[PDB]
Amino acid sequence: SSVSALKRLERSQWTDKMDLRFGFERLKEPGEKTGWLINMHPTEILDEDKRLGSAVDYYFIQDDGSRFKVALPYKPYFYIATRKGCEREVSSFLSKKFQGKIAKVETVPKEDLDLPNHLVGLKRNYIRLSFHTVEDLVKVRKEISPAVKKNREQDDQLDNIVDMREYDVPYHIRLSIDLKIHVAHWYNVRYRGNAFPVEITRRDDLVERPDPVVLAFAIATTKLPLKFPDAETDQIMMISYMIDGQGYLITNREIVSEDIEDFEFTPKPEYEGPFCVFNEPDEAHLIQRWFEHVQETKPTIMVTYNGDFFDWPFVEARAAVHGLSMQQEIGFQKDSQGEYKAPQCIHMDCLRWVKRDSYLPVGSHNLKAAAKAKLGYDPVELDPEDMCRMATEQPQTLATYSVSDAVATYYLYMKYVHPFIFALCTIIPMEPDEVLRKGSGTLCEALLMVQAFHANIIFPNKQEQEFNKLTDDGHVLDSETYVGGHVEALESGVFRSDIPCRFRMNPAAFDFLLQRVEKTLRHALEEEEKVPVEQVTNFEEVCDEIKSKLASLKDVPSRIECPLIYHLDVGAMYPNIILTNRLQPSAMVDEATCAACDFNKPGANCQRKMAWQWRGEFMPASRSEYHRIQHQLESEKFPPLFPEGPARAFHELSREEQAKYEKRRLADYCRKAYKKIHITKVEERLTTICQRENSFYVDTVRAFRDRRYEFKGLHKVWKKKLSAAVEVGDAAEVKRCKNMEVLYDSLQLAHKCILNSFYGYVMRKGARWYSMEMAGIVCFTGANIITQARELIEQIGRPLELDTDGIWCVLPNSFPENFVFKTTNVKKPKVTISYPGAMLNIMVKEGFTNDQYQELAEPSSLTYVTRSENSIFFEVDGPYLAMILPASKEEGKKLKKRYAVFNEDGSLAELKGFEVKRRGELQLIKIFQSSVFEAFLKGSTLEEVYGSVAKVADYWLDVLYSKAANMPDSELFELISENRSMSRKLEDYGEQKSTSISTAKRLAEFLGDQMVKDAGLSCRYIISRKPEGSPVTERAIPLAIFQAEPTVRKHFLRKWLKSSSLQDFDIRAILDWDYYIERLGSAIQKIITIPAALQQVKNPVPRVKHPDWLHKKLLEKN
DNA sequence: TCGAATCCTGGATC
DNA sequence: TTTTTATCCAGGATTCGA
Ligand SMILES: Nc1ncnc2c1ncn2[C@H]1CC[C@@H](COP(=O)(O)OP(=O)(O)OP(=O)(O)O)O1
Ligand code: SF4
Ligand SMILES: [Ca+2]
DSSP states (O other): OHHHHHHHHHHHHHHHHHHHHTTOOBOOSSEEEEEEEEEEEEEEEEOTTSOEEEEEEEEEEOTTSOEEEEEEEOOOEEEEEOSTTTHHHHHHHHHHHTTTTEEEEEEEEEBOTTSTTGGGTOOEEEEEEEESOHHHHHHHHHHHHHHHHHHHHHOOOGGGOOEEESTTSOHHHHHHHHHTOOTTOEEEEEEBTBTSOOEEEEOTTOOOOOOOOEEEEEEEEOOOTTSOOOTTTOOEEEEEEEETTEEEEEEETTTSSSOOOOEEOOSSTTOOOEEEEEEESSHHHHHHHHHHHHHHHOOSEEEOTTTTTTHHHHHHHHHHTTTOOHHHHTOOEEOTTSOEEOSSSEEEOHHHHHTTTSOOOGGGGSHHHHHHHHHOOOOOOOOTTTHHHHHHHOHHHHHHHHHHHHHHHHHHIIIIIHHHHHHHGGGSSSOHHHHHHSOHHHHHHHHHHHHHHHTTBOOOOOOOOOOSOBOTTSOBEEEOOBOOOOOBOOOOEEEETTSOEEEOOOHHHHHHHHTTHHHHHHHIIIIIIOOOGGGBSSHHHHHHHHHHHHHHHHHOOSEEEOEEEEEEEETTHHHHHHHHHTOOTTTEEOHHHHTTOTTOOTTOOOEEEEEEEEEEEEOSSOHHHHHHHHHHHTTOEEOOSSTTSOOEEGGGSOHHHHHHHHHHHHHHHHHHHSSSSOEEEEEEEEEEEETTSOOHHHHHHHHHHHHHHHHHHHHHHHHHHHHHHHHHTOHHHHHHHHHHHHHHHHHHHHHHHHHHHHHHHTTSTTOSSOOSHHHHHHHHHHHHHHHHHHHHHHHHSEEEEEOSSEEEEEEETTSOOEEEEEBOOSSOSEEEEEHHHHHHHHHHHHHHOBSOOEEEEETTTTEEEEOOBOOOOEEEEEEESEEEEOOOSSSSOOOOSOEEEEOTTSSEEEEESOGGGSSSOOHHHHHHHHHHHHHHTSSSSHHHHHHHHHHHHHHHHHHHTTTSSSSOHHHHHHHHOOOOBOOSOGGGGTTOOOHHHHHHHHHHHHHOHHHHTSSSOBOOEEEBSSSTTOOGGGOEEEGGGGGSOHHHHHHHHHHHSOOTTOOOOOHHHHBOHHHHHHHHHHHHIIIIIHHHHTTTOOOSOTTSOOOHHHHHHHHHHO
């Protein structure tokens, strides 16, 4: 014990002296102060009995820049349940048995949503146990739970206790939940000495955030040519940073051959970036100066791009070589999870945001690309191997490179990252860096814990994972799942609003539409717009125009017209599907509970039934065959946990080992004994949703939905006010307005992020509120909605592309489009409607609306009032100028999820899926695909368009047939090389073979394991001819070899090309040109020529032949 | 000996 | 002690049937 006690006191006193050094004095004096809460960390402190107890530190920062700490003592606890009447006997036994370790025990009636017949108002007694310290809590937990495990498996006093709950919420989460303390608010803190607990009370009238000191830093180092750096070998060359918009540079005058003057680097007036420079004689003085300047300026946020991977481990390892210690000078230390942390300031890494919340493609995750897109300028680059000569040859262009990435890290953090995390913390009980690092499911669970606590619900336990469960007909399941979203790719080629197109249409559909126009217009005005139809005067003229247009269409259905291209999209579909049906993870019920519920009377209306599709995958072996395989394990012997350990018996396997050994036997036996390894069985089920259950989940979803639109509105209002303030030109008003704009923008994004999170959480393994039914019923109802939206549109027009929530289509030029009504409302003198929207919203209204919605009108009365609700509405984007869809090289298929679209202005609207955006992909194909889509805008008819794109492909085929005749050799390498990336370490692929693995081994052979050592490797290779007939995986040759020393390059090529006397090693001699020609060929086909053959034009490029199935079909049709 | 189907991985679209 | 799902493309290799 005493070792633990003194360890805890030692670390507490060290941390308290460290944060005292940075100025976070503890609040000492009787009095009241106010401050913005910025951080919290758990700590233990002595009580009036001189006994340790658990506490939490709160860190406050004041308006004037002063800072203070406060410690709040609080006792952790958990709940247990007992059989009839046992609570007095059990609590007395508990208190005598664990005497001195458990502080208090008490009986509490809790409302648990799983109690049979609970809707009448019953609830059950849980005993609470509360402890002096979490150290003592864990021991009693471990003494208790072995009896609960046996009691649960069946279902003295200790035998009687039947369950335990809430035993695994973290201590600071529990404290933030229970006392409602949240970060980025303003508080009053009232202190009275040890005589009484310190009191913290929020005040909502202070709105301006303070401005914490932010430091952003980057480092540059030496390394050996053509190899990765390592901290035992390589010195640091320079370190550069910004603090609150002033920049500094430190330079090592060993390597760098001259002093560097001070200078300004300013990408745009938005980013001033002044820098001031210190020249130091040694690495040790360079590293001394940085720690001195941090201890001087005492930052509260430290930021660096991907610093946890390289920069921090490097500057730590280089400090140890000079007898300094980062953990004593600064205070940062590497946690068990391999991430740096400190008590006194927060380490925020932009790349955890870029990777989670930006919706950039992985190709754009490179720092300079992210800056290019988000900040709209190009930084400068140096080739990583020229830096070491540049340092001697021309120092200041290296300094100019080194600055650019500090500047870009600082302004990227300030603009995008900073408002988002400090907005998102205002609604979630977590630390800022936890909120950044944690997954969105964990962010979404704590919120429901907060909402369940105040409703006095008791948290359910985490979900138990089943292993190798049986199908209900006795077959072991490898999986369970639900069928997801629906996709179709109906048509291919080029659609342009500039060229005629042929339509054929059902006149009874136009008649059906014309017969109901007024319903659709009324419903679109009253229910969506919320303008009563009596307030509009010109209504009948608009209906006369719409009817006469439909009548004109109904006479002549088959026609040639220019197209109109429309996208129709459901807004926030899945939340609205939840809100409309009252789906809740607890609300799904079986026959057995309804049979017990007193409301289950004839004429009750509470049972709503909905359908979903289950899809198991199961093995062919029978139950008895599996059980005989298990019996064959009853006598088996197994290897030890480690080579020194004794051989294990079957009960000494873990349940995961037993499961995997049963999988190994059962799969192998099935493989031999049966023809195919598994069988699928898609199956239809129906599930009841109790309409009267407690509404806390759906009310949370609704509240977030409403707040998002409120903050969007205020954001647009304040942005307009910002434009007005900018025209006024007064800096104080502009600054105030900008602050309000950023506040509402960040709140709006936070609320969108949480709204989007609610769908994903309910399927997470281990989730407290988990169900599979609700997630399947949502996807199925969305698929029914989009199927009926396809069925309707196929008769009015032609759908082109259909996906999870929306449809692309063409409509005939004479279709109604948009109409403007005139209204007497003073705020709303005009209203504009689009007929394609109202046409579908009236279809959704009739089928989907829910007639059973109930709410409890008077909690004491047991009276519920029936309602109705329907929240699902379509909206209309566009129209667009042009739309180009590709086609498949196989006969019976078309490509889904790929297309391009252009705006009316000819600017690129969308370009989805194509290689032009993907990471690690062949540049020649990227440039081709880029140039063709811009070429489709040219020309004036299909035969002009297909004639005019062909000249872009014949340029590149002239290149590949010329072997780059004029092209200077430095261009060719980047044009031709791939750049694929390998996720796992080289061992972990095991037996698997691939071009990346095969070129990783080729790197190990060439440079040693000093390069394979870490994951996330990237491989650049060419593919080579000379090993004739050998499969392609063997011919990958690393690009690096073309920069090696001649005697190394020749030796290794002669080893790899198996060509002993080979005279020429020129890349033009080695390239397998006919591989690349057929890579280009299969892309030019799929874009230009197969779709052309689908639009009654001949092959527009002679050099590339059709596939034989198309050659037959064309020859026979001719 | 020759052709088709299944499998695995890295990365995108909703 | 952790951890959001499902549908789809392109490339390369291995096994079974005619
Ligand atoms: N990252 C993700 N994780 C899980 N499901 C996702 C997802 N992204 C999309 N989905 C699924 C679930 C939602 C669905 C997209 O349809 P909505 O209309 O709900 O989303 P949206 O178009 O973004 O909203 P709008 O801009 O119209 O307001 O795709
Ligand atoms: S659906 Fe009706 S009968 Fe069944 S549990 Fe709910 S309230 Fe009771
Ligand atoms: Ca949508």
